[PDB]
Design an enzyme around this catalytic site. Structure first.
Site, PDB file in Angstrom:
ATOM      1  N   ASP A 107       8.912  18.118   8.580  1.00 59.65           N
ATOM      2  CA  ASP A 107       8.321  17.884   7.230  1.00 59.65           C
ATOM      3  C   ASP A 107       6.874  17.397   7.343  1.00 59.65           C
ATOM      4  O   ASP A 107       6.570  16.305   6.817  1.00 59.65           O
ATOM      5  CB  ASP A 107       9.178  16.942   6.371  1.00 59.65           C
ATOM      6  CG  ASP A 107       8.973  17.121   4.867  1.00 59.65           C
ATOM      7  OD1 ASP A 107       8.261  18.086   4.453  1.00 59.65           O
ATOM      8  OD2 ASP A 107       9.552  16.316   4.108  1.00 59.65           O
ATOM      9  N   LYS A 135       3.436  17.105   5.941  1.00 62.00           N
ATOM     10  CA  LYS A 135       2.685  17.207   4.668  1.00 62.00           C
ATOM     11  C   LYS A 135       1.477  16.284   4.689  1.00 62.00           C
ATOM     12  O   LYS A 135       1.359  15.412   5.546  1.00 62.00           O
ATOM     13  CB  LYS A 135       3.630  16.913   3.511  1.00 62.00           C
ATOM     14  CG  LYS A 135       4.650  15.817   3.739  1.00 62.00           C
ATOM     15  CD  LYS A 135       5.701  15.839   2.645  1.00 62.00           C
ATOM     16  CE  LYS A 135       6.513  14.561   2.527  1.00 62.00           C
ATOM     17  NZ  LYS A 135       6.730  13.891   3.837  1.00 62.00           N
ATOM     18  N   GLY A 138       8.282   3.678  -0.281  1.00 65.59           N
ATOM     19  CA  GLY A 138       9.323   4.705  -0.098  1.00 65.59           C
ATOM     20  C   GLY A 138      10.626   4.312  -0.777  1.00 65.59           C
ATOM     21  O   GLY A 138      10.686   3.240  -1.397  1.00 65.59           O
ATOM     22  N   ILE A 192       0.845  -1.237   0.000  1.00 68.54           N
ATOM     23  CA  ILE A 192       0.000   0.000   0.000  1.00 68.54           C
ATOM     24  C   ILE A 192       0.867   1.269   0.000  1.00 68.54           C
ATOM     25  O   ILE A 192       0.289   2.360   0.030  1.00 68.54           O
ATOM     26  CB  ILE A 192      -0.988  -0.006   1.181  1.00 68.54           C
ATOM     27  CG1 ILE A 192      -0.268  -0.125   2.526  1.00 68.54           C
ATOM     28  CG2 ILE A 192      -2.016  -1.110   0.999  1.00 68.54           C
ATOM     29  CD1 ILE A 192      -1.166   0.142   3.724  1.00 68.54           C
ATOM     30  N   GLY A 250      11.972   1.381   1.662  1.00 68.92           N
ATOM     31  CA  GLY A 250      11.279   0.085   1.542  1.00 68.92           C
ATOM     32  C   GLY A 250       9.774   0.291   1.396  1.00 68.92           C
ATOM     33  O   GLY A 250       9.343   1.454   1.211  1.00 68.92           O
ATOM     34  N   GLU A 251       8.985  -0.782   1.444  1.00 78.42           N
ATOM     35  CA  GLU A 251       7.536  -0.704   1.173  1.00 78.42           C
ATOM     36  C   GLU A 251       6.789  -0.649   2.504  1.00 78.42           C
ATOM     37  O   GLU A 251       7.389  -0.957   3.527  1.00 78.42           O
ATOM     38  CB  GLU A 251       7.058  -1.831   0.237  1.00 78.42           C
ATOM     39  CG  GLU A 251       7.684  -3.207   0.459  1.00 78.42           C
ATOM     40  CD  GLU A 251       7.509  -4.167  -0.713  1.00 78.42           C
ATOM     41  OE1 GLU A 251       6.975  -5.281  -0.521  1.00 78.42           O
ATOM     42  OE2 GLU A 251       7.923  -3.807  -1.823  1.00 78.42           O
ATOM     43  N   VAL A 252       5.538  -0.194   2.469  1.00 82.36           N
ATOM     44  CA  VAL A 252       4.521  -0.432   3.529  1.00 82.36           C
ATOM     45  C   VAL A 252       3.546  -1.488   3.005  1.00 82.36           C
ATOM     46  O   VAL A 252       3.083  -1.355   1.857  1.00 82.36           O
ATOM     47  CB  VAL A 252       3.809   0.875   3.925  1.00 82.36           C
ATOM     48  CG1 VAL A 252       2.740   0.638   4.972  1.00 82.36           C
ATOM     49  CG2 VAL A 252       4.790   1.911   4.432  1.00 82.36           C
ATOM     50  N   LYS A 263       5.759  -1.587   7.951  1.00 84.25           N
ATOM     51  CA  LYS A 263       6.767  -0.754   7.249  1.00 84.25           C
ATOM     52  C   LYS A 263       8.095  -1.504   7.248  1.00 84.25           C
ATOM     53  O   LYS A 263       8.508  -1.923   8.319  1.00 84.25           O
ATOM     54  CB  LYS A 263       6.928   0.605   7.935  1.00 84.25           C
ATOM     55  CG  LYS A 263       7.694   1.634   7.113  1.00 84.25           C
ATOM     56  CD  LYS A 263       7.996   2.890   7.842  1.00 84.25           C
ATOM     57  CE  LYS A 263       8.214   4.051   6.914  1.00 84.25           C
ATOM     58  NZ  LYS A 263       8.685   5.247   7.656  1.00 84.25           N
ATOM     59  N   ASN A 271       1.795  12.454   5.244  1.00 84.74           N
ATOM     60  CA  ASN A 271       2.084  12.033   6.641  1.00 84.74           C
ATOM     61  C   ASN A 271       0.799  12.007   7.467  1.00 84.74           C
ATOM     62  O   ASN A 271       0.865  11.523   8.586  1.00 84.74           O
ATOM     63  CB  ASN A 271       3.072  12.979   7.339  1.00 84.74           C
ATOM     64  CG  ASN A 271       4.440  13.016   6.696  1.00 84.74           C
ATOM     65  OD1 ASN A 271       4.885  12.025   6.124  1.00 84.74           O
ATOM     66  ND2 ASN A 271       5.124  14.132   6.828  1.00 84.74           N
TER      67      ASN A 271
HETATM   68  C1  LIG Z   1       0.436   3.037   9.925  1.00 86.74           C
HETATM   69  C2  LIG Z   1      -0.300   2.926   8.641  1.00 86.74           C
HETATM   70  N1  LIG Z   1      -1.492   2.370   8.534  1.00 86.74           N
HETATM   71  N2  LIG Z   1      -1.882   2.428   7.185  1.00 86.74           N
HETATM   72  C3  LIG Z   1      -0.941   3.006   6.493  1.00 86.74           C
HETATM   73  C4  LIG Z   1       0.093   3.343   7.396  1.00 86.74           C
HETATM   74  C5  LIG Z   1       1.362   4.016   7.029  1.00 86.74           C
HETATM   75  C6  LIG Z   1       1.652   4.434   5.784  1.00 86.74           C
HETATM   76  C7  LIG Z   1       2.899   5.032   5.626  1.00 86.74           C
HETATM   77  N3  LIG Z   1       3.465   5.566   4.489  1.00 86.74           N
HETATM   78  C8  LIG Z   1       4.647   6.106   4.518  1.00 86.74           C
HETATM   79  C9  LIG Z   1       5.188   6.713   3.239  1.00 86.74           C
HETATM   80  N4  LIG Z   1       5.716   8.075   3.502  1.00 86.74           N
HETATM   81  C10 LIG Z   1       4.673   9.085   3.778  1.00 86.74           C
HETATM   82  C11 LIG Z   1       5.429  10.432   3.615  1.00 86.74           C
HETATM   83  C12 LIG Z   1       6.530  10.141   2.549  1.00 86.74           C
HETATM   84  C13 LIG Z   1       6.527   8.602   2.392  1.00 86.74           C
HETATM   85  N5  LIG Z   1       5.395   6.164   5.673  1.00 86.74           N
HETATM   86  C14 LIG Z   1       4.903   5.676   6.844  1.00 86.74           C
HETATM   87  O1  LIG Z   1       5.543   5.727   7.889  1.00 86.74           O
HETATM   88  C15 LIG Z   1       3.616   5.091   6.832  1.00 86.74           C
HETATM   89  S1  LIG Z   1       2.681   4.375   8.138  1.00 86.74           S
END
Ligand SMILES: Cc1[nH]ncc1-c1cc2nc(CN3CCCC3)[nH]c(=O)c2s1
Length: 396
Positions: free
Chosen positions: A198, A200, A85, A82, A88-90, A105, A203
């Protein structure tokens, strides 16, 4: 057959240190220490050292057994990716034994070492583990293998505010709600002695009921005793970043929590106007407009925005010395933009959110867009690539 008493008064001091979850030397940390030492020594070249071969002969068997017993990736079914980055992936995962759904994550150990940046994930772990706030995504488990850090968090099926803003024309009534929730979230982070740097929409995640939580604390820093940081630490794309933080990239400048209030101004503008106030076709174009905010900020006459919303945006998008929030969150909360009939500051998170997600099941990921290599080289000498990750492991 009893012992003669000595080292009992140490056993009590030590058991206290080990049983504190926020202590560097809990049991998981001491196990991380042994696991990491074995991973960084078990290479053919290092094993020609008798001291290393003797140690690995004695501990490699029991350490592989321990690795079997402790939490690992194989304990989760990957339902869907889903997010991806550079780190790595989430992943939307389901724990096999409990059948419970989480977001997991992955952070690549190799990517953090190779691009000199292997200390940012401590604040992320600590905020999500110990914030204990309705405004902060919760960490349940953190574990590691030789390749990845893993963080198991509550799944936020509402998606992020990027996805919301691109699916709806956001009226002021909605903008009030999300801005108020962002302000309470940031106040919670500031109260734990941290500045985000940061903030946005990417986040800002929405839960099952459409209410906001902050995720991604990769850029967070502890304030010193004076409420400031004096650093040159690197940030990424500048669209939501304040002038003082952008300038600090050029070498040690000073900023405090008011840099996060800048970002709320940019967010509120984006919500009401449909683009960021300092948007340009290039990075240097956006950097240039942010430094020149006194001249570069202007509302389209065709956007049509209330006096109160324009006042709040302009009160956020100024120099730090005179920025709204410099003297605390109280002066933000009493801004006339937030006058409404729907919610109070004390109860907002139990009122009806403007967008309640429609979910079909516990693995519905329809508020996330679809999504579909890399190693350490074998070292010739001890380099300790696993040393930076000792103490990451954490069980709620
Ligand atoms: C805890 C949770 N529950 N459902 C989704 C999530 C997360 C999604 C996510 N996505 C990102 C990617 N970044 C965002 C700003 C730049 C890239 N990073 C993270 O820590 C989480 S947690």
């Amino acid at each position: 057959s009893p012992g003669d008493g000595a080292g009992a008064s140490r056993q009590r001091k030590l058991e206290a240190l080990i049983r504190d979850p926020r202590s560097p030397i809990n049991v998981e940390s001491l196990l991380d220490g042994l696991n990491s030492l074995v991973l960084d020594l078990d290479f053919p070249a290092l094993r020609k050292n008798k001291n290393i071969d003797n140690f690995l002969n004695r501990y490699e068997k029991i350490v592989k057994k321990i690795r079997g017993l402790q939490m690992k990736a194989e304990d989760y079914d990957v339902v869907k990716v889903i997010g991806r980055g550079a780190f790595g992936e989430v992943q939307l995962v389901r724990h096999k034994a409990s059948q419970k759904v989480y977001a997991m994550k992955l952070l690549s150990k190799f990517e953090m070492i190779k691009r000199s940046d292997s200390a940012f994930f401590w604040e992320e772990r600590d905020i999500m583990a110990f914030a204990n706030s309705p405004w902060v995504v919760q960490l349940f488990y953190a574990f590691q293998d030789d390749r990845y850090l893993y963080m198991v968090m509550e799944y936020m099926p509402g998606g992020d505010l990027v996805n919301l803003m691109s699916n709806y024309d956001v009226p002021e009534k909605w903008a009030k709600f999300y801005t108020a929730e962002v302000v309470l979230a940031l106040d919670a982070i500031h109260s734990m002695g941290l500045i985000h740097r940061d903030v946005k929409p990417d986040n800002m995640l929405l839960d099952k009921h459409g209410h906001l939580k902050l995720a991604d604390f990769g850029t967070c820093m502890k304030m010193d005793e004076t409420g400031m940081v004096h650093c040159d630490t690197a940030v990424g794309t500048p669209d939501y970043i304040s002038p003082e933080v952008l300038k600090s990239q050029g070498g040690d400048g000073y900023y405090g929590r008011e840099c996060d209030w800048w970002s709320v101004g940019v967010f509120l503008y984006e919500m009401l106007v449909g683009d960021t106030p300092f948007y340009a076709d290039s990075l240097v174009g956006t950097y240039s407009k942010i430094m020149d905010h006194k001249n570069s900020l202007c509302f389209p006459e065709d956007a049509e925005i209330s006096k109160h919303a324009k006042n709040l945006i302009c009160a956020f998008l100024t120099d730090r010395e005179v920025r709204l929030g410099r003297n605390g969150v109280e002066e933000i909360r009493q801004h006339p933009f937030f006058k409404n009939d729907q919610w109070h500051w004390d109860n907002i998170r139990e009122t009806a959110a403007p967008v309640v997600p429609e979910l079909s099941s516990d693995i519905d990921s329809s508020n996330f867009d679809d999504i579909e290599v890399e190693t350490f080289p074998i070292p010739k000498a001890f380099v300790g690539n696993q040393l930076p990750f000792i103490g990451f492991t954490y069980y709620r």
